[PDB]
Design a protein around this motif. Structure first.
Motif, PDB file in Angstrom:
ATOM      1  N   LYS B  27       0.815  -1.231   0.000  1.00  0.00           N
ATOM      2  CA  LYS B  27       0.000   0.000   0.000  1.00  0.00           C
ATOM      3  C   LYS B  27       0.847   1.278   0.000  1.00  0.00           C
ATOM      4  O   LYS B  27       0.401   2.333  -0.521  1.00  0.00           O
ATOM      5  N   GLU B  28       2.064   1.193   0.526  1.00  0.00           N
ATOM      6  CA  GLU B  28       2.908   2.395   0.741  1.00  0.00           C
ATOM      7  C   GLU B  28       3.223   3.173  -0.541  1.00  0.00           C
ATOM      8  O   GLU B  28       3.725   4.277  -0.471  1.00  0.00           O
ATOM      9  N   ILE B  29       2.950   2.565  -1.699  1.00  0.00           N
ATOM     10  CA  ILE B  29       3.215   3.194  -2.982  1.00  0.00           C
ATOM     11  C   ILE B  29       2.266   4.378  -3.235  1.00  0.00           C
ATOM     12  O   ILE B  29       2.510   5.168  -4.154  1.00  0.00           O
ATOM     13  N   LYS B 190       9.096   9.207   6.608  1.00  0.00           N
ATOM     14  CA  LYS B 190      10.442   9.603   6.182  1.00  0.00           C
ATOM     15  C   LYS B 190      11.054   8.421   5.450  1.00  0.00           C
ATOM     16  O   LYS B 190      11.744   8.574   4.448  1.00  0.00           O
ATOM     17  N   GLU B 191      10.771   7.214   5.942  1.00  0.00           N
ATOM     18  CA  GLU B 191      11.457   6.064   5.397  1.00  0.00           C
ATOM     19  C   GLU B 191      10.851   5.697   4.067  1.00  0.00           C
ATOM     20  O   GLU B 191      11.538   5.303   3.131  1.00  0.00           O
ATOM     21  N   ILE B 192       9.551   5.881   3.937  1.00  0.00           N
ATOM     22  CA  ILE B 192       8.915   5.666   2.639  1.00  0.00           C
ATOM     23  C   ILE B 192       9.427   6.684   1.623  1.00  0.00           C
ATOM     24  O   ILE B 192       9.757   6.310   0.492  1.00  0.00           O
ATOM     25  N   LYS B 195      13.229   6.031   0.563  1.00  0.00           N
ATOM     26  CA  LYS B 195      13.550   4.869  -0.248  1.00  0.00           C
ATOM     27  C   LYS B 195      12.881   4.896  -1.579  1.00  0.00           C
ATOM     28  O   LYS B 195      13.466   4.464  -2.545  1.00  0.00           O
ATOM     29  N   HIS B 196      11.653   5.403  -1.640  1.00  0.00           N
ATOM     30  CA  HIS B 196      10.854   5.264  -2.857  1.00  0.00           C
ATOM     31  C   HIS B 196      10.628   6.535  -3.632  1.00  0.00           C
ATOM     32  O   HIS B 196      10.213   6.466  -4.775  1.00  0.00           O
ATOM     33  N   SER B 197      10.919   7.700  -3.047  1.00  0.00           N
ATOM     34  CA  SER B 197      10.825   9.012  -3.770  1.00  0.00           C
ATOM     35  C   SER B 197      12.146   9.830  -3.780  1.00  0.00           C
ATOM     36  O   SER B 197      12.174  11.056  -3.497  1.00  0.00           O
TER      37      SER B 197
HETATM   38 ZN   LIG Z   1       9.381   0.471   1.543  1.00  0.00          ZN
END
Ligand SMILES: [Zn+2]
Ligand SMILES: Nc1ncnc2c1ncn2[C@@H]1O[C@H](COP(=O)(O)OP(=O)(O)O)[C@@H](O)[C@H]1O
Ligand SMILES: Nc1ncnc2c1ncn2[C@@H]1O[C@H](COP(=O)(O)OP(=O)(O)O)[C@@H](O)[C@H]1O
Ligand SMILES: [Zn+2]
Ligand SMILES: [Zn+2]
Ligand SMILES: [Zn+2]
Ligand SMILES: [Zn+2]
Ligand SMILES: [Zn+2]
Ligand SMILES: [Zn+2]
Ligand SMILES: [Zn+2]
Ligand SMILES: [Zn+2]
Ligand SMILES: [Zn+2]
Lengths: 209, 209
Positions: B27-29, B190-192, B195-197
């Motif tokens: 879901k984090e996307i 912050k971690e999302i 890593k992903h943006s």
């Molecule tokens: Zn992640």
């Protein structure tokens, strides 16, 4: 125009701090006070319409509506009463001395019950018994719609704000303290209204969310 | 005007349904998709100001701001990008068919990862992975400020709405589902983002409320 920031008159600020920072077991009286304020606002528009029927062009239906929102930890109390102009919000909800304020702080200090608050002409501040922040949106026939907001701390802000639900009246949104979330329950609200606001002359509508 | 109600185009409604009613991990996307959209809006106003500098009269600072509110279970993503007119909101967030929608539904049912949503031109609806209600305030230099709102009913509403914080750009307020409140945590956000943006060309501000 912009948000304007007002200071609370000094004794009002002291009373607020004392209200927020002292344990009381009898907190349910906030609801009695706010419903009693809504009833007075309703009375005022009702009597006005007897000589001036067009004051109800902004809404004929006279009522109070209570909306707990457990997801957002807010309790909303709205009425279709007379509403408050920008000046009323600034003058009646913070900047002007009230004669009862200091006496009530002293009564509390001597061990009086919190439930006396209304008798001293400061009942609105009972909202801070259960709320960290209170937002008041209000529209009176004689002004545009405005919003008062305070998290205590000695000041409040007033800004312009239109809410399509408030065409005339007052919506008070209480942001409920973590230790007071019980007051968001359908059953608890029903009991308090049933027991302490049974003689109010308008419908009280309770909507779940 | 007042609130208008709009049906989502048929496939989008079906996609929103599949999205809210099927369990997906990853879901984090949603945050990646929403930031990517904010970054595109920032780019468009940036390039515009190259020949029409007065497009920045409504704010020069180009950024993204993230505000979690654990109390209210909301997450707000805001940008000072080009913003959307009423027509953009109506046309671009629901009423016009997108060619990838159906193809994405079949890819999902054939077991593709939800992270592929962006490649099908429907990234915005990833918000309904973590939110029950999504409210979008947007202001474009060519129009008044407007607000889009949907709880995925098969419809959405558009109403006029001024937010002093948005003089140009877009604010997305997500009402986060009960099981997804972990996404409200400072650490997790912050971690999302880290890593992903990773390669977003604008400041991303995180404000803890
Ligand atoms: Zn992640
Ligand atoms: N619901 C309301 N609608 C209109 N005015 C209100 C409302 N609630 C409070 N006020 C204004 O704020 C004032 C202060 O309220 P309160 O502190 O309860 O004192 P009191 O009711 O004793 O006057 C009221 O007198 C009224 O002018
Ligand atoms: N933050 C934003 N500011 C301005 N427009 C946006 C924003 N987010 C989404 N939109 C509009 O909505 C459209 C749909 O977005 P999305 O579903 O993610 O598809 P894509 O991003 O692939 O175009 C975007 O193309 C854009 O026009
Ligand atoms: Zn009162
Ligand atoms: Zn008048
Ligand atoms: Zn005025
Ligand atoms: Zn709150
Ligand atoms: Zn309890
Ligand atoms: Zn009981
Ligand atoms: Zn009781
Ligand atoms: Zn996108
Ligand atoms: Zn919410």
């Amino acid at each position: 125009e912009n948000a304007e920031t007002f200071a609370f008159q000094a004794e009002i600020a002291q009373l607020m701090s004392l209200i927020i920072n002292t344990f009381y077991s009898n907190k349910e009286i906030y609801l009695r006070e706010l419903i009693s304020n809504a009833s007075d606002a309703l009375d005022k528009i009702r009597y006005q319409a007897l000589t001036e029927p067009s004051e109800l062009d902004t809404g004929k239906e006279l009522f109070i509506k209570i909306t707990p929102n457990k997801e957002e930890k807010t309790l909303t109390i709205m009425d279709t009463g007379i509403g408050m102009t920008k000046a009323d919000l600034v003058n009646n909800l913070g900047t002007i001395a009230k004669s009862g304020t200091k006496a009530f702080m002293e009564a509390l200090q001597a061990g009086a019950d919190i439930s006396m608050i209304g008798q001293f002409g400061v009942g609105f501040y009972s909202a801070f018994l259960v709320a960290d922040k209170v937002v008041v949106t209000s529209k009176n026939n004689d002004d545009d719609s405005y919003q008062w907001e305070s998290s205590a701390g000695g000041s409040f802000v007033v800004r312009p704000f239109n809410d399509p639900e408030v065409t005339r009246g007052t919506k008070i949104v209480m942001h409920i303290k973590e230790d007071q979330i019980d007051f968001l329950e359908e059953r608890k609200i029903k009991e308090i209204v049933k027991k302490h606001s049974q003689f109010i002359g308008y419908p009280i509508k309770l909507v779940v969310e």
